[PDB]
């Protein structure tokens, strides 16, 4: 077979110039065409079975001729599909996708373009042979021959409708006008009449022949091959139907022929719905006749768009729903069912900046919502009359297009929150922002007016952002859109940067910021604006006063822990971005406010926490102490160092830390959570770096002999923490305080381990020439960790391990002489997560063990349950 040698490997070759040879030689040799025709199809199935000329010449006995080559494949072991895998993969199989999928399909698609030249199509009799052979070739149980036979049939069906429409519009309809000009008036040519009638008869009969072929293939091949068992065959049956429907509209564009799509809309296979929903939007491009299909299957489309098995089908389902809502086939009640899809129950499963699987879904839903927005926008203008004026001149576009947008998102939220269980507002804001991120490109030019809506000095009437609960959602939507505007696309971002930036000062001055729900999104927006996003606008003048307007609210209001209040994270991210600005005007403001807060704390400790007071309300004063002063300085010391003169520290570590036991009896389980020793480790880690900066003065000029006096504050801090830990070690274990007591001890141990690790890092990172500093460090520091605080550390390790085991229900093996009474452990409202806050403590303990600070029995006790608690613990054990 020489034909397959010039077909499977030839890439850049002429397709039409090779068909004329066989078309003209079939009249010469009748048995040489079908032989090499059938062998070519058999080459792709993967077999050495061949058909001889005397076999293919038996046209009447087609079933037996195809069946005698069938046993040569059933009893054959080694066989692979050379065509299918080459189509699916180009770089994998030996055959590439080039010479076996492009020219291969072009050979059957352009097969009838050459038949009209040599007059072999109408002669006819050569056409019936293929209809006889391929009909019986495409009804077998083996999955090899059926696919290629049905595909060869559909490839000719592709060009059938093409040439039908071509002859209908460029031949018959064109000769009709010539025949119309040869009637009027009183002048028949007669010579040309008998030519016109013959040509028109040919054009009308060729269409009947083509329609007969089409009806044959639709009757015996299409009806039986859309219920097939294979997914690829069933999908290829529907793929090429789009061509026939797009081309020939007389015998295809009907209601009885569009029922197969609504049929296979809910198919058992997965790859069928994909092609179905990819083809469906092409039908609505053309447009009573088609409306009757959607009017009946739109509920099925809703089912597929919402609760489908596969995730890649809903995308194209909503793509169809896009044009559905465009043409108005969808009712107002059915829009709310798809609008709430912007709030899927999955919270951040993949990613956002990389445009993952969760991105395309929300993008398609926003594309759908845009059409509904525009529909209601254009429909509301004609129903109600427009007043002459508004704010300034006439804002006919954005005002109406945003005013209705407020109802849309809130109703979409309520429709999905009425069904699912109630969640807190913190879980609502995140989902609303995840949704509003993708709405940025669709309200990119109108958002200019949204800012002016927040300064509601002007008014407008409504026939038939006011209150605070509405302005909250207003701000959250706007500032979610702001953050989402930076990731997708280009050019649509810098315009908004230049437009919306200056109004931030007016936003702060107009809307009061007493509650934190007002402060959350306003400062969430500020994060996505850097130096280039503020200098290129020409409004770096207002940033100076913006920082002060934020500082006033930071100083006035009280800020609690991050577990209860949200202002903690807000101001933390704010200060971090302001520090990453790196501008000297901004640092001095925060430093001055640090000094002011330090003076306020000093005067607070002088009389409020004075040890000469008879007030037994430590529970009421400790909360105020940690909210008004301590947490603020702990947040500010993140990026702006804080220093404390030893007088304030010795009036603090005396009146507070060395006084906690005689206060703990009044403490409840909510005040104890607020207490965190993250500030006493800040004071050390800043005086442990301000001296590493002095080591950088060896290569300069101009020690002061304060090395003994230098370690005094840090030594006092570590000694007070050790004393507090050992004093909390002796406490009554009643059920009321057994949680707060252990939480306090855990926090103290965490801060102490941080301080000890930092000091032992500083001592080892020193060069060998600095001996007079090693002497002072080994003289002024008698103990880094007292041996009783080590027992307390072991107690906390135990406690956390036993809570982990109580959660995982696995018994713990430990030494005999031990407080085994704490194996059944109480409920704990301090530790929201017990897997993380336990492995963190384990990591800290292992880091201490590496520095030869803890004994070896400690290492033996720590690694006793390396097999019970999974591989994460053995990772710490070995590595």
């Amino acid at each position: 077979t020489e034909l397959f040698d010039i077909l499977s490997t030839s890439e850049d070759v002429s397709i039409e110039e090779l068909l004329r040879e066989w078309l003209e030689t079939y009249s010469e040799n009748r048995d040489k065409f079908l032989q090499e025709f059938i062998n070519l199809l058999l080459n792709c199935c993967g077999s050495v079975a061949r058909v001889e000329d005397h076999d293919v010449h038996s046209n009447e006995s087609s079933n037996e001729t195809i069946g005698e080559i069938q046993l040569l494949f059933q009893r054959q072991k080694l066989h692979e599909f050379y065509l299918l895998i080459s189509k699916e993969n180009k770089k994998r199989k030996n055959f590439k996708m080039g010479p076996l999928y492009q020219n291969f399909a072009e050979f059957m698609t352009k097969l009838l373009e050459v038949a009209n030249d040599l007059q072999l199509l109408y002669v006819g009799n050569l056409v019936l042979d293929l209809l006889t052979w391929l009909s019986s070739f495409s009804v077998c149980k083996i999955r090899c021959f059926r696919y290629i036979s049905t595909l060869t049939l559909y490839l000719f069906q592709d060009y059938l409708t093409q040439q039908a429409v071509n002859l209908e519009k460029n031949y018959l309809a064109k000769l009709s006008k010539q025949l119309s000009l040869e009637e009027k008036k009183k002048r028949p040519n007669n010579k040309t009449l008998e030519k016109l009638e013959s040509t028109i008869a040919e054009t009308q009969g060729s269409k009947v022949v083509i329609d007969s072929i089409i009806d044959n293939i639709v009757k015996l091949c299409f009806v039986h091959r859309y219920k097939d068992v294979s997914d690829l065959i069933r999908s290829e049956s529907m793929l090429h139907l789009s061509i026939w429907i797009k081309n020939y509209p007389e015998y295809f564009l009907k209601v009885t022929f569009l029922k197969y799509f609504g049929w296979l809309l809910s198919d058992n296979s997965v790859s069928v719905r994909l092609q179905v929903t990819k083809i469906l939007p092409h039908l609505i491009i053309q447009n009573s006749a088609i409306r009757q299909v959607f009017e009946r299957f739109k509920t099925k489309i809703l089912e597929v768009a919402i609760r489908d098995v596969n995730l890649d089908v809903r995308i194209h389902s909503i793509q169809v729903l896009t044009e559905a809502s465009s043409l108005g086939y969808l009712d107002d009640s059915e829009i709310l069912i798809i609008s709430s899809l912007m709030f899927d129950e999955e919270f951040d499963p993949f990613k956002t900046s990389s445009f993952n699987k969760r991105s395309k879904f929300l993008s398609t839903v926003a594309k759908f919502l845009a059409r509904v927005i525009k529909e209601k926008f254009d429909e509301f203008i004609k129903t109600h009359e427009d007043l002459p004026k508004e704010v300034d001149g006439l804002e006919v576009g954005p005002v109406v297009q945003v005013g209705i947008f407020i109802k849309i998102l809130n109703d979409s939220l309520i429709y999905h929150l009425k069904d699912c269980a109630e969640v807190d507002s913190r879980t609502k804001i995140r989902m609303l922002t995840q949704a509003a991120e993708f709405l940025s490109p669709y309200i990119s030019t109108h958002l200019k007016t949204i800012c002016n809506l927040l300064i509601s000095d002007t008014e407008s009437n409504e026939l038939i952002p006011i209150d605070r609960n509405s302005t909250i959602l207003y701000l959250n939507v706007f500032h979610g859109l702001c953050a989402g505007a930076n990731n997708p696309k280009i050019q649509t971002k810098d315009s908004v940067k230049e437009i919306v930036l200056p109004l931030f000062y007016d936003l702060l001055n107009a809307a009061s910021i007493e509650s934190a729900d007002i402060l959350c999104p306003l400062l969430e927006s500020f994060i996505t604006f850097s130096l280039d996003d503020w200098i290129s606008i020409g409004y770096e003048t207002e940033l100076k006063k913006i920082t002060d307007k934020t500082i006033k609210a930071f100083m006035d209001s009280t800020i609690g822990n991050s577990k209860v209040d949200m202002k903690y994270d807000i101001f933390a991210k704010f200060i971090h971005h302001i520090h990453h600005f790196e501008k000297k005007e901004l640092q001095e403001k925060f430093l001055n406010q640090i000094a002011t807060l330090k003076i306020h704390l000093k005067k607070f400790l002088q009389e409020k926490m004075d040890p000469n007071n008879s007030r037994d309300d430590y529970k009421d004063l400790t909360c105020s102490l940690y909210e008004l002063y301590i947490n603020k300085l702990t947040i500010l010391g993140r990026d702006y160092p804080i220093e404390v003169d030893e007088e304030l520290l010795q009036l603090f570590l005396n009146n507070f830390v060395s006084r906690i036991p005689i206060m703990f009896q009044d403490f409840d389980d909510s005040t104890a959570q607020e207490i965190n020793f993250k500030m006493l480790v800040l004071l050390a880690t800043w005086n442990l770096e301000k001296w590493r900066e002095i080591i950088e003065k060896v290569r300069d000029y101009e020690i002061s002999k304060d090395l003994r006096s230098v370690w005094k504050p840090i030594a006092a801090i570590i000694g007070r923490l050790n004393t507090l830990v050992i004093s909390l070690a002796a406490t009554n274990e009643t059920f009321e305080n057994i949680n707060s007591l252990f939480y306090l001890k855990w926090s103290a141990c965490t801060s102490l381990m941080d301080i000890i690790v930092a000091i032992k890092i500083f001592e080892l990172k020193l060069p060998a020439d600095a001996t007079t500093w090693r002497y002072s460090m080994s003289e002024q520091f008698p103990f880094y960790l007292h041996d009783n605080a080590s027992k307390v550390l072991l107690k906390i390790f135990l406690y956390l391990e036993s809570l982990f085991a109580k959660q995982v229900d696995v018994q713990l093996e430990r030494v005999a002489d031990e407080d085994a009474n704490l194996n059944d452990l109480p409920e704990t409202g301090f530790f929201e997560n017990i897997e993380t806050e336990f492995l963190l403590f384990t990591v800290k303990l292992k880091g201490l063990m590496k520095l030869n600070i803890l004994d070896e029995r400690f290492a033996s006790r720590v690694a006793l349950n390396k097999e019970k608690l999974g591989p994460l613990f053995k990772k710490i054990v070995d590595d």
Binding site: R638, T685, E689, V757, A758, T836, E837, L839, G847, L872
Partner: peptide
């Protein structure tokens, strides 16, 4: 999914343990 959390451990530790950018890059051993 609950037992196998190897990559999450680094992120959780580096988040919960650190609250200052400058001292952490010099007081956190390798």
């Amino acid at each position: 999914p609950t037992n196998f959390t190897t990559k999450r451990l680094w992120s959780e530790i580096t988040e919960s343990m650190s609250y200052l950018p400058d001292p952490i890059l010099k007081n956190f051993l390798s």
